[PDB]
């Protein structure tokens, strides 16, 4: 089922987390990498993602699976470039990773790259998966 | 909603009938194609499909919603396989169709191909639907 998509996204070894989340009706995680962050995304966090406030999360970022993130570019609700780019808030600790959230008709494809992995590479991977999903009526 | 599985299963046009039957406790059709055969499957018939005694299959087949079928292969109760290939029985030069029945924890998935669709194609669609369900603990 949806498990194949997560395996597909993680296959090249450049990412550490991935998830496909339904946001219509009742937000639910359809498949996510086990023991990680995205598997714990909540309906409230999803609500913020597809929300009306597109600039409030610019000073104060947001949270995905509890993880605080900094929005570095928001184009989630934009015609064409239906993506959002974020970084993992290294408020404490040290390692920061690039995340990309892409949106389709019924889902939100989330990808988190490993340390050092170029952001645009995460954007490419996340964006192409969603492009495949939307053309497949999803 | 279970009817969405029916729509999904019926989308490519290869099938003419489909159903998701709950066999545990009190057996019933959770979803089927209105105006077709599977929708009329009885608890007695469901009992025949999941009983441990497979005697009648090899005696003279079995019926699905009244429709008599011949058992090509019965591995329904067999672990790791959980599938049974059938073929409708006809009178006159009326066509015969491939039917596959797969089982999960709480469900029986039924599919009847249209004339000319190979049994192997029917078996894959069904098995794939059954693997998805069992992954969701169904």
């Amino acid at each position: 089922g949806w498990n194949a998509y997560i395996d597909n996204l993680m296959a090249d070894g450049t990412c550490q987390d991935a998830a496909i989340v339904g946001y219509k009706d009742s937000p639910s995680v359809w498949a996510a990498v086990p023991g990680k962050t995205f598997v714990n995304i909540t309906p409230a966090e999803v609500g913020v993602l597809v929300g009306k406030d597109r600039s409030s999360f610019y000073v104060n970022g947001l949270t995905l699976g509890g993880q605080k993130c900094s929005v570095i570019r928001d184009s989630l609700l934009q015609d064409g470039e239906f993506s959002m780019d974020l970084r993992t808030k290294s408020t404490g600790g040290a390692p920061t990773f690039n995340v990309t959230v892409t949106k389709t008709d019924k889902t939100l494809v989330l990808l988190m790259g490993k340390e050092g992995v170029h952001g645009g590479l995460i954007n490419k991977k996340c964006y192409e998966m969603a492009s495949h999903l939307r053309r497949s009526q999803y | 909603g279970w009817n969405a599985y029916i729509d999904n299963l019926m989308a490519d046009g290869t099938c003419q009938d489909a159903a998701i039957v709950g066999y545990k406790d009190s057996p019933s059709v959770w979803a089927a194609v209105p105006g077709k055969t599977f929708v009329n499957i009885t608890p007695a018939e469901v009992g025949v499909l999941v009983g441990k005694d497979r005697s009648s299959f090899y005696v003279n087949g079995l019926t699905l919603g009244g429709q008599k079928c011949s058992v090509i292969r019965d591995s329904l109760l067999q672990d790791g396989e959980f599938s049974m290939d059938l073929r409708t029985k006809s009178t006159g030069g009326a066509p015969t169709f491939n039917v596959t029945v797969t089982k999960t924890d709480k469900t029986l998935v039924l599919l009847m191909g249209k004339e000319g669709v190979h049994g192997g194609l029917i078996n894959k669609k069904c098995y794939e639907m059954a693997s998805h369900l069992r992954r969701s603990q169904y």
């Binding site: 089922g1 495949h132 999903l133 | 969405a4 998805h132 169904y138």
Partner: peptide, 10 residues
């Protein structure tokens, strides 16, 4: 690039 999977149960 697999085909879209079934939706989640119920």
């Amino acid at each position: 690039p697999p085909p879209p999977p079934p939706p989640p149960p119920p």
